Design an enzyme around this catalytic site. Structure first.
Site, PDB file in Angstrom:
ATOM      1  N   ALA A  10     106.670 -52.536 -34.783  1.00 40.77           N
ATOM      2  CA  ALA A  10     107.465 -53.270 -35.538  1.00 40.77           C
ATOM      3  C   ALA A  10     107.411 -52.803 -37.232  1.00 40.77           C
ATOM      4  O   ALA A  10     107.882 -53.354 -38.167  1.00 40.77           O
ATOM      5  CB  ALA A  10     107.003 -54.910 -35.509  1.00 40.77           C
ATOM      6  N   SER A  11     106.314 -51.649 -37.465  1.00 43.84           N
ATOM      7  CA  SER A  11     106.428 -51.390 -38.782  1.00 43.84           C
ATOM      8  C   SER A  11     107.559 -50.698 -39.344  1.00 43.84           C
ATOM      9  O   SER A  11     107.396 -50.518 -40.737  1.00 43.84           O
ATOM     10  CB  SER A  11     105.051 -50.542 -38.847  1.00 43.84           C
ATOM     11  N   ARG A  12     108.306 -50.090 -38.704  1.00 41.63           N
ATOM     12  CA  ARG A  12     109.474 -49.420 -39.188  1.00 41.63           C
ATOM     13  C   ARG A  12     110.682 -49.156 -38.511  1.00 41.63           C
ATOM     14  O   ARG A  12     110.339 -49.793 -37.069  1.00 41.63           O
ATOM     15  CB  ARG A  12     109.064 -47.984 -39.795  1.00 41.63           C
ATOM     16  N   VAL A  61      99.197 -49.157 -28.692  1.00 41.94           N
ATOM     17  CA  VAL A  61      99.862 -49.226 -27.638  1.00 41.94           C
ATOM     18  C   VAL A  61      98.998 -47.926 -26.560  1.00 41.94           C
ATOM     19  O   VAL A  61      99.435 -48.035 -25.344  1.00 41.94           O
ATOM     20  CB  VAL A  61     101.152 -49.246 -27.250  1.00 41.94           C
ATOM     21  N   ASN A  87     108.937 -51.438 -27.836  1.00 43.96           N
ATOM     22  CA  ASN A  87     109.734 -50.580 -28.581  1.00 43.96           C
ATOM     23  C   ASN A  87     109.144 -49.330 -29.073  1.00 43.96           C
ATOM     24  O   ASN A  87     109.673 -48.279 -29.400  1.00 43.96           O
ATOM     25  CB  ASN A  87     110.367 -51.144 -29.650  1.00 43.96           C
ATOM     26  N   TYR A 151     109.464 -35.320 -23.921  1.00 42.06           N
ATOM     27  CA  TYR A 151     110.133 -36.573 -24.208  1.00 42.06           C
ATOM     28  C   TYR A 151     111.093 -37.167 -23.352  1.00 42.06           C
ATOM     29  O   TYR A 151     110.745 -38.364 -22.739  1.00 42.06           O
ATOM     30  CB  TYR A 151     110.777 -36.341 -25.419  1.00 42.06           C
ATOM     31  N   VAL A 152     112.022 -36.450 -22.773  1.00 37.01           N
ATOM     32  CA  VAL A 152     112.818 -37.076 -21.513  1.00 37.01           C
ATOM     33  C   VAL A 152     112.099 -37.489 -20.597  1.00 37.01           C
ATOM     34  O   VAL A 152     112.359 -38.276 -19.930  1.00 37.01           O
ATOM     35  CB  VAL A 152     114.109 -35.874 -21.222  1.00 37.01           C
ATOM     36  N   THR A 154     109.126 -38.544 -20.121  1.00 35.26           N
ATOM     37  CA  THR A 154     108.561 -39.662 -20.171  1.00 35.26           C
ATOM     38  C   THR A 154     109.509 -41.142 -20.451  1.00 35.26           C
ATOM     39  O   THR A 154     109.370 -42.139 -19.900  1.00 35.26           O
ATOM     40  CB  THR A 154     107.625 -39.878 -21.665  1.00 35.26           C
ATOM     41  N   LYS A 155     110.759 -40.797 -20.924  1.00 36.39           N
ATOM     42  CA  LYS A 155     111.824 -41.966 -21.026  1.00 36.39           C
ATOM     43  C   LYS A 155     112.446 -42.102 -19.378  1.00 36.39           C
ATOM     44  O   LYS A 155     112.731 -43.231 -19.140  1.00 36.39           O
ATOM     45  CB  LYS A 155     112.972 -41.574 -21.742  1.00 36.39           C
TER      46      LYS A 155
HETATM   47  N1  LIG Z   1     115.173 -42.500 -33.629  1.00 34.83           N
HETATM   48  C1  LIG Z   1     115.838 -42.014 -32.561  1.00 34.83           C
HETATM   49  O1  LIG Z   1     116.487 -41.029 -32.763  1.00 34.83           O
HETATM   50  C2  LIG Z   1     115.510 -42.301 -31.334  1.00 34.83           C
HETATM   51  C3  LIG Z   1     116.569 -42.054 -30.352  1.00 34.83           C
HETATM   52  C4  LIG Z   1     116.183 -42.396 -28.803  1.00 34.83           C
HETATM   53  O2  LIG Z   1     117.116 -42.101 -28.013  1.00 34.83           O
HETATM   54  C5  LIG Z   1     115.194 -43.458 -28.513  1.00 34.83           C
HETATM   55  N2  LIG Z   1     114.554 -44.032 -29.708  1.00 34.83           N
HETATM   56  C6  LIG Z   1     113.107 -44.546 -29.304  1.00 34.83           C
HETATM   57  O3  LIG Z   1     113.225 -46.001 -30.287  1.00 34.83           O
HETATM   58  C7  LIG Z   1     111.961 -46.543 -30.282  1.00 34.83           C
HETATM   59  C8  LIG Z   1     111.650 -46.652 -31.702  1.00 34.83           C
HETATM   60  O4  LIG Z   1     111.308 -45.620 -32.389  1.00 34.83           O
HETATM   61  P1  LIG Z   1     112.171 -45.495 -33.901  1.00 34.83           P
HETATM   62  O5  LIG Z   1     112.144 -46.724 -34.565  1.00 34.83           O
HETATM   63  O6  LIG Z   1     113.602 -44.712 -33.766  1.00 34.83           O
HETATM   64  O7  LIG Z   1     111.116 -44.285 -34.562  1.00 34.83           O
HETATM   65  P2  LIG Z   1     110.016 -44.720 -35.696  1.00 34.83           P
HETATM   66  O8  LIG Z   1     110.667 -44.865 -37.163  1.00 34.83           O
HETATM   67  O9  LIG Z   1     109.188 -43.344 -35.648  1.00 34.83           O
HETATM   68  O10 LIG Z   1     109.249 -45.923 -35.561  1.00 34.83           O
HETATM   69  C9  LIG Z   1     108.278 -45.628 -34.340  1.00 34.83           C
HETATM   70  C10 LIG Z   1     107.546 -47.205 -34.103  1.00 34.83           C
HETATM   71  O11 LIG Z   1     106.828 -46.754 -33.096  1.00 34.83           O
HETATM   72  C11 LIG Z   1     105.288 -47.389 -33.480  1.00 34.83           C
HETATM   73  N3  LIG Z   1     104.424 -46.540 -32.925  1.00 34.83           N
HETATM   74  C12 LIG Z   1     104.092 -45.393 -32.558  1.00 34.83           C
HETATM   75  N4  LIG Z   1     102.872 -45.078 -31.802  1.00 34.83           N
HETATM   76  C13 LIG Z   1     102.466 -46.278 -31.770  1.00 34.83           C
HETATM   77  C14 LIG Z   1     101.175 -46.552 -31.193  1.00 34.83           C
HETATM   78  N5  LIG Z   1     100.493 -45.764 -30.480  1.00 34.83           N
HETATM   79  N6  LIG Z   1     100.759 -48.015 -31.153  1.00 34.83           N
HETATM   80  C15 LIG Z   1     101.648 -48.885 -31.800  1.00 34.83           C
HETATM   81  N7  LIG Z   1     102.809 -48.691 -32.213  1.00 34.83           N
HETATM   82  C16 LIG Z   1     103.242 -47.195 -32.098  1.00 34.83           C
HETATM   83  C17 LIG Z   1     105.328 -47.074 -35.054  1.00 34.83           C
HETATM   84  O12 LIG Z   1     104.524 -47.706 -35.777  1.00 34.83           O
HETATM   85  P3  LIG Z   1     102.930 -47.284 -36.271  1.00 34.83           P
HETATM   86  O13 LIG Z   1     101.942 -47.684 -35.149  1.00 34.83           O
HETATM   87  O14 LIG Z   1     102.696 -48.108 -37.475  1.00 34.83           O
HETATM   88  O15 LIG Z   1     103.101 -45.962 -36.641  1.00 34.83           O
HETATM   89  C18 LIG Z   1     106.753 -47.243 -35.318  1.00 34.83           C
HETATM   90  O16 LIG Z   1     106.922 -48.578 -35.781  1.00 34.83           O
HETATM   91  C19 LIG Z   1     111.064 -45.167 -29.771  1.00 34.83           C
HETATM   92  O17 LIG Z   1     110.508 -46.024 -28.269  1.00 34.83           O
HETATM   93  C20 LIG Z   1     111.948 -44.145 -29.732  1.00 34.83           C
HETATM   94  O18 LIG Z   1     111.606 -43.201 -28.557  1.00 34.83           O
HETATM   95  C21 LIG Z   1     114.462 -43.349 -30.814  1.00 34.83           C
END
Ligand SMILES: NC(=O)c1cc(O)c[n+]([C@@H]2O[C@H](COP(=O)(O)OP(=O)(O)OC[C@H]3O[C@@H](n4cnc5c(N)ncnc54)[C@H](OP(=O)(O)O)[C@@H]3O)[C@@H](O)[C@H]2O)c1
Ligand SMILES: NC(=O)c1cc(O)c[n+]([C@@H]2O[C@H](COP(=O)(O)OP(=O)(O)OC[C@H]3O[C@@H](n4cnc5c(N)ncnc54)[C@H](OP(=O)(O)O)[C@@H]3O)[C@@H](O)[C@H]2O)c1
Ligand SMILES: NC(=O)c1cc(O)c[n+]([C@@H]2O[C@H](COP(=O)(O)OP(=O)(O)OC[C@H]3O[C@@H](n4cnc5c(N)ncnc54)[C@H](OP(=O)(O)O)[C@@H]3O)[C@@H](O)[C@H]2O)c1
Ligand SMILES: NC(=O)c1cc(O)c[n+]([C@@H]2O[C@H](COP(=O)(O)OP(=O)(O)OC[C@H]3O[C@@H](n4cnc5c(N)ncnc54)[C@H](OP(=O)(O)O)[C@@H]3O)[C@@H](O)[C@H]2O)c1
Lengths: 235, 235, 235, 235
Positions: A10-12, A61, A87, A151-152, A154-155
């Site tokens: 939720a941070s970004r 997570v 997410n 990446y793929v 895992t999805k």
């Molecule tokens: N952007 C694309 O192009 C694209 C394309 C697509 O097909 C699918 N998607 C999918 O969309 C989803 C949201 O990603 P998205 O918003 O685009 O990416 P980004 O701006 O890097 O923010 C990532 C967030 O995740 C958090 N986070 C990370 N690790 C964490 C942890 N261990 N524990 C808890 N949280 C963790 C991290 O927070 P922080 O922990 O504070 O660093 C941040 O809030 C993902 O599933 C993608 O696979 C994207």
């Protein structure tokens, strides 16, 4: 009328945008991510500007104990939840023989196991509320890209996981959200990339989610795939 | 600001509901189906109650010449179109060895060829407007059901058709709409069946469509699958 | 020990090659296609050189009455059948807006309805013998190609059809054969094209089929996809 | 004429059966698994009875360093390899909320990461020989089962992994082998279960593999799915 939505990552990015969109509809929010500074900032804004209740708490997570403590604190704060947005996710992009053990493991821990942990932690609660679990996978949950092997994979796993959760829990609604490329920090990038380079904007995704979440409780949205018109349509 | 939506199978069911929903957002509408009496009735109501322009015309999507004349008259009435909803469809349900030549042919002519005819007739127009073609296939466009052989095969075909149109025309947005069971006249039934027997209501589907169609023009919603919580989740 | 295999599209290409391969294992053969001259030629050769029984008869799978008469004559000749190879098929390749009604209809009649007719005509017989129905679809039964809209849609339909037959008849084995490009007359071509241009040879496909058909009767081969190393691996 | 096949999970089950089948065609074999006692026993038998060369070595595919040492020793023994069978795998079956972290992690390490490690270790060698990598996934690499969430997710991942390897390395042939239930030690069982309970026998799978591997080098078998006639046909 008051409903509670939990959002991971939720941070970004997409998670933040979903939080903002659901706040517009008056959801109470429970926000989780590792960047607690960011969560606090978002929370204070939404509380004052949207008049909603917001709880936030550190969440990693990739760690079983973190997810368990997070869910405990969220359920303590709000009682049962109505929406869980799993997410959090990340991507490293390299040919399969170049991808490191560390990179592959991290994607597995977040994109697959992190989703599993998030959903199982709130599963009893969602069962009670006939709630909705939304998982942000990817359009590549059902297709392939070069450099995307780790990446793929895992999805694809996450898609199987979500559908299995659904079969096993027909009293809960599971929603697989499959965005194409989005302008976020994903992939070691930063927001600000123009749509024309092939990017959706997080607020667009969040609006799609918000209006679908307005559907009656007996409607189960199972899958939504959406991409930029500037992203080549590949299957 | 004025946008034009063409809807096939607009005389009842999902098509009618989509017409009503888009009218709420001020779309001009071009309605097609074989039941012109029904179209007129719907049209007069929407014109007066929603203040939108409505054109209607006989359309039998199983006939090449009917689709061509319909598209000619629609384009003459409105100029280019922004949304085309290829929704007309039908289902006969029998074991494959019991399904008749007549039944199989009709499903092919409407569910597959009818969609093809509808999309190609408006394709040049959509290309100009960067428009959106929405095709109502089915959740069974990617799964199997006993007794569904004829129907399912045509919906699998329709999915391939839509995706191929998309690849071939990256300047147009193609949206595959995949509802589960819906309470309509589909399958020789009549509306009025309760949700609890495993049915979505047409107005719910139409609301999902309407709010997604509010997304910016550079967002391409490619797939939406949704079903009743009372329909068993099968894949 | 004597087993009977029926093969449609046996006059050339993959069907002919399968006939030749099964003859090597001593199958009695029933051959069907529109080119009876070709069937006779193949039949006389296999009878003398392989010492098998061969029956041939005109078959146009686009005509319900032809398939029914063919099956009647085959069952009269041999009694029940053990293997049915529904292989007849054709492809026209054009952008969807350029494909003619005639072209699309022919592909539907052969690739989809022809398969349906062939399988239902022999279904009671296969049920009795716990037999095997092999359908030559294509690798594109589960992927997309530009210019392939009409052809691909029929093969997607054929895949759904075969799987539905399987669900509905668990006492019969259904085998979806999915070759990539093969050096035949397919697509208005002629044999003689080199492997390096991206073509399998029919005898290779037929050998794969023959050795798989040697598996015990309680083994159900459901799907085989194979392509030339010279064909780009696309999914 | 001498070809070399590497087989992981060679100590029992499908891997052992594949080793035995390829020995019948005169392959030199490199066998890997954790049970070196079993490997030695199999090796001595095949060397004497089939007259082939056999090398065996401890291999734990869940450990990066083990796979690397194994591949080093195999390549040292034989020079380049022609066939790599990434077959090691395991399954725990429980509802997703009951599956333990330990169980999920082990399935990931073997079914997904183990396959990745095996293929990347021999990738340069296969590229040189235009060789064949066969991966034993499962019929559930593309479908869902209750209680199978952890196992299924890893097999979906493995399918994406294999296809990605293929895209990235078009000079190598990748073969996804998708058996249904097989009578082995899989799932905490033991061999000896009758076919009628819904099991293929390992020797049947191995014969299918062996005869397909006899195809010319320019034939790329990409996918084979097969199950017992006694296993319900589910998709
Ligand atoms: N952007 C694309 O192009 C694209 C394309 C697509 O097909 C699918 N998607 C999918 O969309 C989803 C949201 O990603 P998205 O918003 O685009 O990416 P980004 O701006 O890097 O923010 C990532 C967030 O995740 C958090 N986070 C990370 N690790 C964490 C942890 N261990 N524990 C808890 N949280 C963790 C991290 O927070 P922080 O922990 O504070 O660093 C941040 O809030 C993902 O599933 C993608 O696979 C994207
Ligand atoms: N209801 C479900 O359960 C369910 C489940 C699912 O998965 C998918 N879907 C799919 O939803 C779509 C809308 O069907 P739906 O609204 O549920 O069904 P129904 O109430 O029977 O209205 C049919 C409309 O089509 C029209 N129409 C028919 N033939 C025509 C022709 N030749 N030319 C032109 N139009 C023709 C007919 O009009 P008319 O011509 O006047 O008789 C009527 O307006 C179909 O694609 C389904 O496959 C449904
Ligand atoms: N070759 C490829 O590249 C490629 C790629 C791929 O992915 C899938 N496949 C699929 O492989 C199968 C065999 O085709 P293939 O062997 O490659 O093509 P070709 O040499 O043209 O022989 C066609 C045979 O069909 C018969 N036939 C035609 N119409 C008929 C009718 N109405 N009634 C009865 N029979 C009819 C025709 O006989 P005739 O009636 O005497 O003219 C002839 O024997 C098809 O399903 C493809 O879709 C191919
Ligand atoms: N049987 C089925 O029903 C069914 C259904 C289906 O759909 C797919 N499949 C898939 O078939 C493949 C072969 O399994 P299968 O032969 O049926 O099972 P089993 O008799 O238990 O022998 C397992 C072998 O793997 C080895 N092994 C295990 N861990 C290892 C490690 N860390 N490092 C290295 N090797 C490791 C183990 O050797 P050892 O190390 O000495 O203990 C043994 O040789 C798997 O991918 C299944 O997912 C099966």
């Amino acid at each position: 009328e008051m409903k509670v939505a939990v959002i991971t990552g939720a941070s970004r990015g997409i998670g933040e945008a979903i939080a903002r969109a659901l706040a517009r509809d008056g959801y109470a929010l429970a926000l989780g991510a590792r960047s607690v500074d960011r969560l606090e900032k978002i929370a204070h804004e939404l509380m004052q500007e949207q008049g909603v209740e917001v709880f936030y708490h550190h969440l990693d997570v990739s760690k079983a104990e973190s997810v368990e403590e997070f869910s405990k604190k969220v359920l303590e704060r709000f009682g049962d939840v109505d929406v869980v947005v799993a997410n959090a996710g990340l991507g490293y992009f390299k040919r399969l023989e170049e991808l490191s053990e560390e990179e592959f493991h991290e994607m597995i821990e977040v994109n697959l196991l992190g989703v599993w942990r998030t959903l199982k932690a709130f599963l009893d609660s969602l069962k009670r509320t006939g709630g909705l679990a939304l998982v942000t996978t990817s359009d590549v949950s059902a297709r392939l890209i070069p450099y995307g092997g780790g990446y793929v994979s895992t999805k694809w796993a996450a898609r199987a996981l979500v559908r299995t959760f659904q079969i096993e829990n027909p009293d809960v609604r599971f929603f697989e959200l499959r965005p194409g490329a989005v302008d976020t920090y994903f992939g070691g990038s930063k927001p600000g990339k123009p749509k024309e380079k092939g990017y959706l904007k997080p607020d667009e995704i969040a609006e799609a989610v918000r209006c679908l979440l307005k559907l009656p409780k007996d409607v189960r949205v199972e899958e939504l795939m959406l991409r930029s018109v500037y992203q080549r349509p590949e299957y």
